[PDB]
């Protein structure tokens, strides 16, 4: 949370997961804010500024579920980490196709449009321990 972070992650209580947006993504996100807005008040409780590399680390939010908690990411971020992410998805036992269960602006920018999708795809985060 200094000022070099390429991405920001926020908790999405309604999806029992977390979202992630990036510095170069201008879209609105399920948290009701763009990266710019989140950046303007970043470390607060509920969200933190991070390096994209962190996302594919064995340590990534380890205590709270790791990768499994991610329900939304910009398509561009998925592309940037794809190979790395699929790898981690497999080692975590989520299946190589886990990345396709994660929503993006290709599905929606709000919780309301996203939940339906997460349910259809049987996203793991919906049946895990309460994120909080
Ligand atoms: Ni920082
Ligand atoms: Ni920084």
Curated annotation (Swiss-Prot):
Ni(2+) 1 binds at residues 2-4. Coiled coil: none annotated. Disulfide bonds: none annotated. Ni(2+) 2 binds at residues 2-4. Signal peptide: none annotated. The beta subunit generates CO from CO(2), while the alpha subunit (this protein) combines the CO with CoA and a methyl group to form acetyl-CoA. The methyl group, which is incorporated into acetyl-CoA, is transferred to the alpha subunit by a corrinoid iron-sulfur protein. Tetramer of two alpha and two beta chains. This is Carbon monoxide dehydrogenase/acetyl-CoA synthase subunit alpha. It comes from Moorella thermoacetica (Clostridium thermoaceticum). The chain holds residues 594 to 729 of 729 of the full protein.
């Amino acid at each position: 949370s200094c000022g070099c972070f390429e991405a920001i992650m926020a908790i999405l209580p309604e999806c029992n997961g977390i979202m992630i947006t990036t510095r170069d993504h201008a879209g609105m996100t399920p948290s009701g804010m763009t990266f710019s807005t989140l950046a303007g008040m970043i470390q607060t409780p509920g969200f933190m500024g991070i390096g994209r590399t962190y996302i594919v680390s064995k340590k990534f939010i380890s205590a709270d579920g790791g990768i499994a908690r991610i329900v939304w990411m910009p398509k561009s971020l998925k592309d940037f980490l794809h190979d790395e992410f699929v790898r981690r998805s497999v080692e975590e036992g989520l299946g190589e196709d886990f990345i396709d269960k994660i929503a993006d602006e290709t599905i929606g920018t709000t919780v309301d449009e996203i939940l339906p999708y997460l349910e259809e795809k049987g996203h793991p985060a919906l049946t895990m321990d309460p994120i909080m």
